[PDB]
Scaffold this active site. Structure first.
Site, PDB file in Angstrom:
ATOM      1  CG  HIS A  72      -1.582   7.521  -3.628  1.00  0.00           C
ATOM      2  ND1 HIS A  72      -0.611   6.664  -3.156  1.00  0.00           N
ATOM      3  CD2 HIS A  72      -2.762   7.055  -3.150  1.00  0.00           C
ATOM      4  CE1 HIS A  72      -1.184   5.688  -2.468  1.00  0.00           C
ATOM      5  NE2 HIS A  72      -2.487   5.916  -2.430  1.00  0.00           N
TER       6      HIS A  72
ATOM      7  CG  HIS B 137       3.647   4.506   2.776  1.00  0.00           C
ATOM      8  ND1 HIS B 137       3.995   3.829   3.928  1.00  0.00           N
ATOM      9  CD2 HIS B 137       2.322   4.283   2.595  1.00  0.00           C
ATOM     10  CE1 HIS B 137       2.924   3.238   4.430  1.00  0.00           C
ATOM     11  NE2 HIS B 137       1.895   3.497   3.640  1.00  0.00           N
TER      12      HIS B 137
ATOM     13  CG  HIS C 197      -4.021   7.083   1.909  1.00  0.00           C
ATOM     14  ND1 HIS C 197      -4.914   6.097   2.263  1.00  0.00           N
ATOM     15  CD2 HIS C 197      -3.640   6.814   0.637  1.00  0.00           C
ATOM     16  CE1 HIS C 197      -5.030   5.237   1.263  1.00  0.00           C
ATOM     17  NE2 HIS C 197      -4.280   5.659   0.259  1.00  0.00           N
TER      18      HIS C 197
ATOM     19  CB  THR D  45      -2.269   1.054  -4.857  1.00  0.00           C
ATOM     20  OG1 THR D  45      -2.305   2.111  -3.898  1.00  0.00           O
ATOM     21  CG2 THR D  45      -3.627   0.958  -5.584  1.00  0.00           C
TER      22      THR D  45
ATOM     23  CD  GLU E 299      -1.788   4.760  -5.956  1.00  0.00           C
ATOM     24  OE1 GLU E 299      -2.731   4.289  -5.296  1.00  0.00           O
ATOM     25  OE2 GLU E 299      -0.614   4.384  -5.817  1.00  0.00           O
TER      26      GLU E 299
ATOM     27  CG  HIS F 160      -6.779   6.019  -2.562  1.00  0.00           C
ATOM     28  ND1 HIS F 160      -5.582   5.381  -2.812  1.00  0.00           N
ATOM     29  CD2 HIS F 160      -7.324   6.295  -3.772  1.00  0.00           C
ATOM     30  CE1 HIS F 160      -5.404   5.298  -4.120  1.00  0.00           C
ATOM     31  NE2 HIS F 160      -6.450   5.839  -4.723  1.00  0.00           N
TER      32      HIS F 160
HETATM   33 ZN   LIG Z   1      -4.066   4.853  -1.610  1.00  0.00          ZN
END
Ligand SMILES: [Zn+2]
Ligand SMILES: O=C(Nc1cc(S(=O)(=O)[N+](=O)[O-])cc([N+](=O)[O-])c1O)Nc1c(F)c(F)c(F)c(F)c1F
Ligand SMILES: O=C(Nc1cc(S(=O)(=O)[N+](=O)[O-])cc([N+](=O)[O-])c1O)Nc1c(F)c(F)c(F)c(F)c1F
Ligand SMILES: O=C(Nc1cc(S(=O)(=O)[N+](=O)[O-])cc([N+](=O)[O-])c1O)Nc1c(F)c(F)c(F)c(F)c1F
Length: 257
Positions: free
Chosen positions: A93, A61, A91, A195, A103, A116
């Protein structure tokens, strides 16, 4: 499992993880005119000079870089936190286009990506115990905008070919996460959640005001990773972000005027 598709995406997660509809879910929109300046918030203390990175991995993911958290080597203190939080992993997003991917949002503005840095509270002994506690984790969130290249990100970009598909990992030693930080450490903070599943409500969020800039070529290499495993039909890893959740009975605090 869960994912970011039409049939398994964030709108479906509550069926397996009912806390998805809980009282302190993340991410949220930061309304800059409703955030409260709190003069009692103290500066963040980021002590990463002794950080020991270990491996980089595609977990299906996102991609993560993991650190040695067996000793107080890379720690986050101060700000709204009590006690000492150890860096475990970071990591990202990101989106399929430059105007989506973060996010958190700021006055409904989306950034191209969000970094993050995940830390856990050492008083709980290991990260598994910390996820059970309302003050167990602290995640430092950094926005990415597209502009000039970030030199400290290039070592991550250049290894992504080796972890293209789910389950691949590579040695990733001697990476200095200080090269990912903006100049200013001014921040917003609020109590929230992971999240991704299990969406546990254990996170003090610290979201930095100042984005970092990355080049189009750098973010483009994020978008060539795959959600699928090797030998499966290719699905590009893009838009691995959860949409903003209701703020409910929470106040976002700002460290700055
Ligand atoms: Zn994250
Ligand atoms: O505890 C969970 N995982 C976990 C616990 C421990 S532990 O040390 O606390 N036992 C150690 C590790 N580990 O990998 O070391 C773990 O991965 N997941 C989890 C959950 F299952 C729930 F039902 C739930 F509601 C929730 F919020 C959750 F986050
Ligand atoms: O949060 C975890 N990972 C994670 C968090 C986020 S995020 O919430 O920070 N976004 C994003 C990604 N990602 O790769 O995208 C992640 O892989 N692991 C984890 C854990 F270490 C525990 F000890 C535990 F008990 C548990 F339930 C856990 F699930
Ligand atoms: O992910 C962990 N927990 C976890 C993940 C997911 S997830 O895969 O769906 N995100 C869902 C649930 N859940 O309660 O359902 C979980 O409890 N723990 C964990 C960890 F702490 C590590 F340090 C580590 F290296 C590792 F491999 C781990 F597996």
């Amino acid at each position: 499992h869960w994912g970011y598709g039409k049939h398994n995406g964030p709108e479906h997660w509550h069926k397996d993880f009912p806390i998805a509809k809980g009282e302190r879910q993340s991410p949220v929109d930061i309304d800059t005119h409703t955030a409260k300046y709190d003069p009692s918030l103290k500066p963040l203390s980021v002590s990463y000079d002794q950080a020991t990175s270990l491996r980089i991995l595609n977990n299906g993911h996102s991609f993560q870089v993991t650190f040695d958290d067996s000793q107080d080597k890379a720690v986050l203190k101060g700000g709204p936190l009590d006690g000492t939080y150890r860096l475990l992993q970071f990591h990202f997003h990101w989106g399929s286009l430059d105007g989506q991917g973060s996010e958190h949002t700021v006055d409904k503005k989306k950034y191209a990506a969000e970094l993050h840095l995940v830390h856990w509270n050492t008083k709980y002994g290991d990260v598994g115990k910390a996820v059970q506690q309302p003050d167990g984790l602290a995640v430092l969130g950094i926005f990415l905008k597209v502009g000039s290249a970030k030199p400290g990100l290039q070592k991550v970009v250049d290894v992504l070919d080796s972890i293209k598909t789910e389950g691949k990992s590579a040695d990733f030693t001697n990476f200095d996460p200080r090269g990912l930080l903006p100049e200013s450490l001014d921040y917003w903070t609020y109590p929230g959640s992971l999240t991704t599943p299990p969406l546990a409500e254990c996170v003090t969020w610290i979201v930095l005001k100042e984005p970092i800039s990355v080049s189009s070529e750098q973010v483009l290499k994020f978008r060539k990773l795959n959600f699928n495993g090797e030998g499966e039909p290719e699905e590009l890893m893009v838009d691995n972000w959860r949409p903003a959740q209701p703020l409910k009975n929470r106040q976002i605090k700002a460290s700055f005027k």
